[PDB]
Amino acid sequence: PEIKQAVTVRPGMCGPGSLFVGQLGDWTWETVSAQCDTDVFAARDASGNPTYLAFYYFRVRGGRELHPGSLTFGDRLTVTSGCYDQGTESVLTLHRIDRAGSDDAQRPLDLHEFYERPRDGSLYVENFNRWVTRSAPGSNEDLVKSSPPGFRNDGLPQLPAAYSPRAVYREARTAHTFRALDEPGFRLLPDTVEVEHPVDIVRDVNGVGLLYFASYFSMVDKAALALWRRLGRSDRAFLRRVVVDQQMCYLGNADLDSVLTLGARVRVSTETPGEELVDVVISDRDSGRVIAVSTLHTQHDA
Template structure:
């Protein structure tokens, strides 16, 4: 595959869904967060088209900026299209559909397929959750409208929707597929897998790393911590764990992410330092499959900022599990 999308690609809105032809360009692919950033753009564009509003310039009833923030983000990679498997010039067909999720939220599904694959024009929840095409990448985004409660501060953000957010005509997602209860459990436990994923054994002792918020890379144009930077921050911590286990950077770059979930539970101001606790497991039946569960907290307050679970498929099975590696701080 090739990674980079041409922003000039034709976007064809059809009510609650949007389709587009994408040619991967350098600004959309790397070993970092560029692809997730582009997905976020597609989400905002899809919500804007489905709700008939300018998402990028949204305002509260008081005239303050309102932002369609990310609360839950899931990416499931396919055999052909997966997050770090794109390359320059790859051609993709993207189908996006927006669903009603209350008066202050929206849920968007994306299907990213290799160009030419015969698929239904519209993505339905049953395809996403029950019968995914093995060649495609699927994305689930739950977004909530927020605004700053205090000027210049990223703490205590308020849930508030702009008055022109028109959601009543959007289709409703069947409750069986709602991520609401999952996100609530993750937030309460500070983990997707508090007891480890079933069928997996510990691959390393939990380790905790520190990360200082980078004002050059981690903030967006509104001064908020950028949703895509959470992916790169978590990957930075995971890479540090891999190195502590004697694995090479080349092996890390060759990994295939088959499933990643992120719960966004807080933002942060410049000057914040985080602690990121990483736990890792390996499949008992398929040694090349691993899962890492990470929690990001403010170092000073202990406040939970975000949680992720990353399922990876390695090109070759790593060495036997190392359960005696020293803790890193």
Template sequence: MVTVTVLAAVVQARTEVVWPSMCGHNSLFVGRIGDWTWDAVGAACGIDVMNTHDSQGRPAYLSFCYFRIRGGRRFHLRTPTFGDRLQVDTALYRTRGQSVLALHRIDRSPRRHGDGFDLHEFVTAGDADRLYVQTLNRWVARSREGSNQALLRSLPSDFALDSLPEIPPSYCPLPTMRRARMAYTLRPAAAVLSGEGLRLDYQIDPSRDLNGVGLLYFASYFSIVDWALLRWWRQQRRTDETFLGRVVVDQQMCYLANVDVSVTISADVRAWRPMTGPRPHSEFVEVVLRDGQRRLVVSTLEILTDDSR
């Protein structure tokens, strides 16, 4: 096995206490991870990520293009609760195309805080007491004032990636993102369709789904996916109690587009059973959000079934 360790200069460590505003059956914890990403990029690259502009003077935003959260039975996305103390180590890389890859290792065991950062650990997600989070971010700007459609890739004039090492190709999520963009799926290739799918309509809620600059908030996509998942869950004659107790050991989200306020989007939900792999009794639920023919998000959740717990 080849072990790749990042340069110490780009590893940032923090200790966080879980407050009520950052946990629960919602997207609050995902939003907080997004804040840690922005904070890390700002510190490493010497830029005010919340107040920067491109060469044309347009506000530039460090958008999320890809998000992956991996955990285990003992510690997954819904596990953190009031008063937990978390150790968060963050490493940053640059990728081709001026994108930033952030790797967050979230640990409930302070005795290991700040130990070596092994990229292979993020591939295997082998520690059941850790969360492994990958985010890939690119700078965007609006092409038309007041519109969330047709966002442009646009670098801030004062942004530089020289201080970050380049991610080795074998650990880069760009091929996964290309598959999501071309095939609109993130599920394993060796999987068979399971049960009936479901199509739903969801109206973007301007009182809840937008961020402070009027874009559909990246964490709101997680909430909308869970909204669709719950309705599919009930269609399978499963209870709300088992929904709250679900264990999602791997969730991937590929962001393809943003959407304007008050638009009604559709959500397609389908489930797949893996034919091979380390967890043959898990199920993969795929949620694709779209605005007409325009895909917005492709998300896949690996959920442990009763047989695999």
């Protein structure tokens, strides 16, 4: 039983920051709760420790016709949501977003449609989430895999082998990009940036004292802005950027006194002017960990 709902775009789920991905994550927790007969918000492991359904791999796919920067107050959307079986320790949640008028907004989720040929005018969200607990109270390092009792993955529809987010994130942690460096039609610019980012305790921290999943998207855009400025491009042009595809892998969290490093590089298209691929790696130098990788497929007019 897929879920189909009418949404009107609110101030808390749009704009050039991370509010839309924050709202999508709330929707994911509601969708897993409904489909897996589990209260995700208050989940505890068999032993009684809180268990968080942590974001691990996050993709948002759009296009010139509908992307996250298209959305403004009062836009009417149709949202179709559903979970896919990834066993007892993980779960995949898909959301399709259409403009509520649109031809065929009533169509069900179509994996073929999500993994192979996304349609122009729809937005596609993939959230792969993993149950975790803390390994020590107040530590945000070395989180441990978990599963709350009664988590019902059984019955959920299955992905075919071709559609594996696991294959995708395994390659991205190795390559530090989601788009192979040897992919034709792009040139790697020499200009790169490295930004020191102390954890912002007033803006980066969630209600359980971890770094907030949506803050990782804010940190990647801070890196992307720093590279944009290194390229001599304007702050107003940054706000016109169209992100047609963004992938994020959350390899680690971090303690709230950490100083993170945000590294960014870009490949510009040889074929299409104003098209580029930006890669961002978030490091925690003091613990020697890479804690995130993101790739943004971007169209601009700077």
